[PDB]
Amino acid sequence: AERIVTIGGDVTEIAYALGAGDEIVARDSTSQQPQAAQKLPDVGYMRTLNAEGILAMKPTMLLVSELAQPSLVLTQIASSGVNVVTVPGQTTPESVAMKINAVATALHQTEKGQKLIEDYQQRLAAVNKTPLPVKVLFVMSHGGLTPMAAGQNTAADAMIRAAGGSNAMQGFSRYRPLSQEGVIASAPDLLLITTDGVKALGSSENIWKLPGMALTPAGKHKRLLVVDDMALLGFGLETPQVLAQLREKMEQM
């Protein structure tokens, strides 16, 4: 009897996993999993929401990532009588269980949430996170906006560390434009990028034309790992599988 709008691909996938599929009426553009979600109306991008697009779906509940913007839109939706449930957005392996908890509590499925958490925790524990001497550079890019490198306090940094690797970029937080000297000094062994990042550059071969990139170990061997954006950076249920693959890629080298 509820009508749920879910915002954040991590959140949507969790809500489906807890059995709420029948009640989900719309989602945001970052929500493409499971495949059923793709058939639902799309209310806008998580970071550029508008109230009308959500209210048009006549929701009773909005399950929304803390990463959603603008915050004013959430306030407007709550004022309209919709139950707005914020889901934690911390980009850490500990955070996934808190996300499951938040959604399970809202859906009155605490028991199923506890089981999903137990499973996630065991899958995460099984990934080898012991340090490996491999440096990874993550590049974030847009359709025409300057390509950037991720430093600390980013989702990409957290994933690299959780797989036992080292971020090639050190000493700054969030993102900085790529420079030839900084990229060369960072000397990454592996280039990590999302599918949308490749789309913005046009092709994978354009990665190797970025500043300094051809003059790094990664560039010398065109060593790369391209991952779906929400799987790589979203900190959802598939986080252990992504970490296991990142670990394997670092090991094979």
Distances (CA, A) of 182 to 152, 158, 216: 15, 21, 11
Identity of the residue, 121 or 152, whose beta carbon is nearer to Br ion in the bound complex: 152
From the list 46, 77, 87, 97, which residue makes contact with Br ion (rule: CB under 5 A)? 46
Identity of the residue, 68 or 127, whose beta carbon is nearer to Br ion in the bound complex: 68
Q: Which stretch binds Br ion (CB under 5 A): 4-12, 16-24, 39-47, 70-78?
A: 39-47
Tally of CB atoms within 10 A around 126 = 10
Q: Which residues touch 207 (CB under 8 Å, ≥6 apart)?
A: 139, 191, 193, 198, 201, 213, 224
Does 154 bind Br ion (CB under 5 A)? Our answer is yes
- Nearest approach in angstroms of CB 189 to Br ion is 11
Identity of the residue, 79 or 153, whose beta carbon is nearer to Br ion in the bound complex: 153
Q: Which stretch binds Br ion (CB under 5 A): 37-45, 159-167, 179-187, 211-219?
A: 37-45
Identity of the residue, 118 or 205, whose beta carbon is nearer to Br ion in the bound complex: 205
- Nearest approach in angstroms of CB 130 to Br ion is 23
Q: Which stretch binds Br ion (CB under 5 A): 120-128, 151-159, 162-170, 197-205?
A: 151-159
Judged on CB neighbours under 10 Å (0-12, 13-18, 19+), 219 is buried
Give the position of tokens 């209210």: 55
Identity of the residue, 109 or 194, whose beta carbon is nearer to Br ion in the bound complex: 194
Q: How many residues bind Br ion (CB under 5 A)?
A: 8
Give the Cα separation of 208 and 223 in Å (integer).
10
Identity of the residue, 45 or 172, whose beta carbon is nearer to Br ion in the bound complex: 45
Omega within 30 of 0 (cis) for the link into 188: no
Q: Nearest to residue 60, comparing CAs of 29, 33, 32, 25?
A: 25
- Nearest approach in angstroms of CB 213 to Br ion is 14
Does 230 bind Br ion (CB under 5 A)? Our answer is no
The dihedral built from the CA positions of residue 251, 160, 235 and 98, taken in this order, carries a sign that is positive
Q: Nearest to residue 250, comparing CAs of 127, 93, 122?
A: 127
Strands (E), the chain: 4-7, 24-27, 61-65, 83-87, 135-140, 148-150, 166-167, 175-177, 190-194, 224-227
From the list 84, 155, 162, 243, which residue makes contact with Br ion (rule: CB under 5 A)? 155
| Binding track over 194-223 against Br ion, x by CB under 5 A | -----------------------------x
Q: What is the contact surface with Br ion in residues (CB under 5 A)?
A: 45-47, 150, 154-156, 223
